[PDB]
């Protein structure tokens, strides 16, 4: 049959209907007693101009097509070159969209700072109103206005710790007394250990 080679497209788009395919073959170098890879670059015909740099393609022998072209792409084994071009094109629009979005967000935050404390707390506490109550409204309550973010973090942290510790305690207890774990396995439906942990974790 025809000579066939597998290679990487290493240069495309610089010649009309021609690409450069780098192929490698196993040779024995007796001077160093080693199996080596011998590399070569082929000028290869590409009807349709479907290949791109970085594709893994199979080239097949043909009639002479020019002074140096004797092979043609017979099949695209792997098409990373086309994928690279696709992502190149897509990223152009993808990036610019959120680039405009976050610039808008930055400008809005700047304006919020532009049109922009202790005085308000003094007025709310002492007056507890002289046309200032509704003016504050436009911006039990002294506390909820003074609500730092750290408190929510601590509540979430205690929730996380409780969940982990409870899951582990329940798992150890069920693995200890192995009758009730069977009870629970037939209630919910060495693999039994993993399935038991699954049921306990969904349990809470």
């Amino acid at each position: 049959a025809r000579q066939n080679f597998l290679g990487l497209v290493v240069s495309q788009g610089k010649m009309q209907k021609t690409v450069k395919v780098r192929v490698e073959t196993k040779v024995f170098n007796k001077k160093i007693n080693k199996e080596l890879f011998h590399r070569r670059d082929y000028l290869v015909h590409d009807e349709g101009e479907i290949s791109r740099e970085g594709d893994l393609v199979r080239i097949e022998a043909t009639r002479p097509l020019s002074k140096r072209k004797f092979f043609a792409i017979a099949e695209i084994i792997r098409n990373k070159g086309q994928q690279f071009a696709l992502y190149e094109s897509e990223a152009q629009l993808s990036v610019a969209k959120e680039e405009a979005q976050k610039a808008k967000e930055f400008l809005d935050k700047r304006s919020v700072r532009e049109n922009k404390l202790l005085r308000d707390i003094r007025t709310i506490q002492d007056a507890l109103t002289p046309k200032e109550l509704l003016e504050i409204k436009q911006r039990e309550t002294v506390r909820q206005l003074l609500q730092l973010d750290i408190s929510g973090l601590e509540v979430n942290l205690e929730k996380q710790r409780s969940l982990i510790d409870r899951i582990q305690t329940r798992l150890s207890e069920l693995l200890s007394n192995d009758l009730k774990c069977d009870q629970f396995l037939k209630d919910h439906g060495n693999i039994k250990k993993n399935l038991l942990r699954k049921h306990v974790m969904m349990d809470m």
Partner: protein
């Protein structure tokens, strides 16, 4: 798509029909016989031996 002036497939392998190869390479005289002359007899013997071989 293969190159413009090329053939996509390797040429069609043409298997030998030995009966036809014999029929065309060495066919026997379709005329029944002539059986005259001397050199004609020598040539007939040589031809049949060559064909048989």
């Amino acid at each position: 798509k293969h190159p413009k002036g090329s053939h996509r497939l390797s040429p069609k392998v043409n298997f030998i029909d030995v009966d036809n190869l014999i029929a065309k390479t060495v066919a026997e005289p379709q005329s029944i016989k002539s059986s005259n002359g001397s050199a004609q007899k020598v040539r007939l013997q040589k031809a049949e031996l060559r064909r048989k071989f």
